[PDB]
Structure formats: structure tokens, C-alpha cells
Amino acid sequence: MIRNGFYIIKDRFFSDMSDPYLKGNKKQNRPHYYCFEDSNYNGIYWMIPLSSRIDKYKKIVSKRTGKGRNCDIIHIVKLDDSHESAFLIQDMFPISDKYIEREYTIAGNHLRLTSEHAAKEIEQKARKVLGMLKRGIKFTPTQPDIQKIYERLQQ
Amino acid sequence: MIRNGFYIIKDRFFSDMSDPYLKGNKKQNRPHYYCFEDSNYNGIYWMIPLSSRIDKYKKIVSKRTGKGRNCDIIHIVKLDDSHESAFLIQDMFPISDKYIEREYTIAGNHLRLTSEHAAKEIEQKARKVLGMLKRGIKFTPTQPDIQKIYERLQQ
RNA sequence: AAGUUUACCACUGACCGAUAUGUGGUAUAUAAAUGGUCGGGUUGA
RNA sequence: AAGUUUACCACUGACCGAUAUGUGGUAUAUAAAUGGUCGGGUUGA
Ligand SMILES: [Ca+2]
Ligand SMILES: [Ca+2]
Ligand SMILES: [Ca+2]
Ligand SMILES: [Ca+2]
Ligand SMILES: [Ca+2]
Ligand SMILES: [Ca+2]
Ligand SMILES: [Ca+2]
Ligand SMILES: [Ca+2]
Ligand SMILES: [Ca+2]
Ligand SMILES: [Ca+2]
Ligand SMILES: [Ca+2]
């Protein structure tokens, strides 16, 4: 994987981890964003699932925004396919190389977040969210057990 | 000289160049800012004179700002002595090492523009102003002849 | 797909302090990314 | 101290064009610094 690219993840990942709170892979159709490599173990990569349910995710953003705060758990931006996507940073999770199926493409090119300023903002939000998750913060009552996944990946 | 430092220039410079439009050096009491070294000749340095006449220079800035444009010829910023200074980028000029008298000081330390973001903005404004001056632009009818000075410095 | 609880840790430039509505980090604090503001301070335009 | 006339050159990301109210550069354009918008285009949530 290359940083800021979008990818499809093998269903095998989801059946191996068996976590009912990960965003469903929709049979290898949900694009996932590769945010950054883990600092502590090489070969573990942090991914963020996307959703196109903008009406739903805008309301969640506006919960914070309407109180004068940034939303770190969701970030909505127009991708290079010219449509808006929600990055569910809240639901980010770790993965290893063997679980990656392929590049997510647009007309046979690799879709990726080419706008560096958007990538940078997303990366910051993700570091913050991951920091908070590691310290036991729960943004929803249905939060994936990324600690369990992370330990399983430690091969 | 070190980039972003303030300096006093020898009166000898001003009597040698005899340019009535350079900002008067007030008998070696006008601080001057060292912006950047000349690209074409080492040992030639571009300087910017300062003025504390903020009321006057604010009006000149607002001529452009009031039409929605940036002012590049004048930039006003609070220095580390906690007072506002006008950088008369319009009146910038070249100099060589032998015309520098000494560091401009605050309580025996070297006054300099430590706020990098301000230094960067000023450097950009200066590159633009110098570019325009080299192409014959005249911001005032009383503009120093920096070409003549620049040639004299070449020796 | 559904699901909707923002924590903690440091940092904020003449120099000496302080500080968040600013900066970044994620168990680390000689890091990273900021450089505003307030008090002291101050030859010089 | 007084003095108060903003030019030109390129650049604006799946890909192909275009563009300044955006980016930077100063005689250079395989540079630098930006990455919005419009038109085309588009398996997948
Ligand atoms: Ca794009
Ligand atoms: Ca379109
Ligand atoms: Ca300062
Ligand atoms: Ca003060
Ligand atoms: Ca510091
Ligand atoms: Ca301090
Ligand atoms: Ca403190
Ligand atoms: Ca450091
Ligand atoms: Ca480019
Ligand atoms: Ca283009
Ligand atoms: Ca063009």
C-alpha cells in the first residue's frame, strides 16, 4: 500500500476478526483509506472506512461544529471522483498486508487522496482519534475492538 | 550579517551613494532589516529600512487593502521590542559587508525578526517588490536608484 | 449497515515570566507543531 | 525625513482541458509555491 491511497480489503479480514462493530465490507465493495503505518510494528497499517451517507454523517459533524468545535471522528471531503465521501475516522482499525485485496480504481487508475492539505487534516484527526481510543474513549456504544485486532496481527 | 537580523548601516554608505531618495539614515540610528543575499553576486545583501511613522504608513497600506488587495510595498509588524514598525519594502536596496556598522540591539542582544511567519511574509513581499523594481516599476516619484547602487557594489 | 460519549500530555521565540479561545503528540515530552496575547524588559526610525 | 504609480512570467493534482478573486518566481519556467472552482470524465460505500 501507498499512503493516502484507497483500497479494497478481503472479506477474509472481516471473517477472521469477527468484530460486529467494524463497518461492513459489503462483499469487497467498501473503499478504505490507508492513513499511516503503525509506529510500533512495521507491517501494521491503519485504515479508515468510507461511507457515502453524507446526510447522516453531516448531522454527526454538526453536533460538534454547531458548538464551535472541530469534528475529528468524521471528516467529509470531495474525492477526485468529484463526489463527497465521509471518512469514519471513529471506526479506524489496523490491518496487515495479506488482507489487502487490491487498489480501488477510477477508470483503471488508482483512486487516492491527491489533495495533500486534505490528507494532512485527516492524518491529524486520525492521530488524535487513535490516541483517544487507546485511552479508553468511546465515541459510540458500538465501537470496534481494535486492541484485539492489533494483538491478533502481531503475527 | 545573519538573515532576519536588524543592523545599523555606516553613514559612509549614504555619502558614497549620494541618493536623495534613500530613507535618511539619521546619523546611524535607523534600523535596517537584512532580508536576503543577492542571487547573482555573493557579498551583496538586500536591506529594508524601517520607520516608526505608523499613522502615515498604515494609510498607504489601506490604499490597497481597502480595494481588497495585499500591500507588498509596506508591511507593518510588532517587533520583539513590542512596538510596531513599518518595513518600507518599497525602498529596499543593496549593500555590501564593509558598509555594515553593527548589530541593532535590545539590551545588548541582537534584535531580529524571530517570528518566522512574519519573516517569511516579508521575504515574499520583498521578492515581489524587487522583481517589479527590476522591471522599471515606480511606486513613488521619488524612488532610489538601486540599479546604480548595485553596479557600484560590483566594484 | 446499524451505532454517536472529545480524553490526556507537553508546547506557544531578544531576555525573564505567564497563558488559550492557538500548536501539535498518543504514553512520549530534549517529541511534534505553533509564535498570538498579557506583565516585566527596551539607546536609536 | 519627505515622497505613494503593483508589472511581468509560469503554476492551480485519477485522467483530459480551462481558470483567478488562488499559488509562488524575478528574467527564469523541467523553477517555486499552491490544489479551489468550472467543463469533460467516473464499477464498488
Ligand atoms: Ca482532485
Ligand atoms: Ca463534474
Ligand atoms: Ca516576539
Ligand atoms: Ca509590553
Ligand atoms: Ca521554543
Ligand atoms: Ca518562555
Ligand atoms: Ca507554563
Ligand atoms: Ca526538536
Ligand atoms: Ca502541481
Ligand atoms: Ca488540470
Ligand atoms: Ca494554461
Residue numbers in the entry:
A (entry chain A), B (entry chain E): 1 to 155
According to the publication:
The best diffracting crystals (1 native and 2 SeMet) were isomorphous, and, following phasing through SAD, the final structure was solved to a resolution of 2.2 Å. The unit cell contained a total of eight protein (CptNEr) monomers each complexed with a single CptIEr RNA repeat of 45 nt. Examination of the symmetry units reveals that each protein–RNA heterodimer formed a self-closing, heterotetrameric ring-shaped complex with a heterodimer from the neighbouring asymmetric unit. The heterotetrameric architecture is a major deviation from the heterohexameric complexes formed by the other structurally-defined Type III TA systems. The structural core of the CptN protein is similar to the structures of the three previously solved Type III toxins, being made up of a highly twisted antiparallel β-sheet. Of note is the absence of the kink in the third helix that is seen in the structures of ToxNPa, ToxNBt and AbiQ; the equivalent helix H4 in CptNEr is visibly shorter in comparison and, as a result, CptNEr more closely resembles the structure of the Type II Toxin Kid. Each CptNEr protein binds two CptIEr RNAs, and the protein–RNA interfaces are considerable for both. The CptIEr RNA observed bound to CptNEr is a classic H-type pseudoknot of 45 nt, which is derived from the two genetic cptIEr repeats. While the Pectobacterium and Bacillus ToxI structures are very similar to each other, the fold of the CptIEr differs markedly from the ToxI paradigm, and is also structurally extremely unusual among known RNA pseudoknots notably in the structure of the loops. L2 forms a short, three-stranded helix which has been previously referred to as an A-minor twist motif.
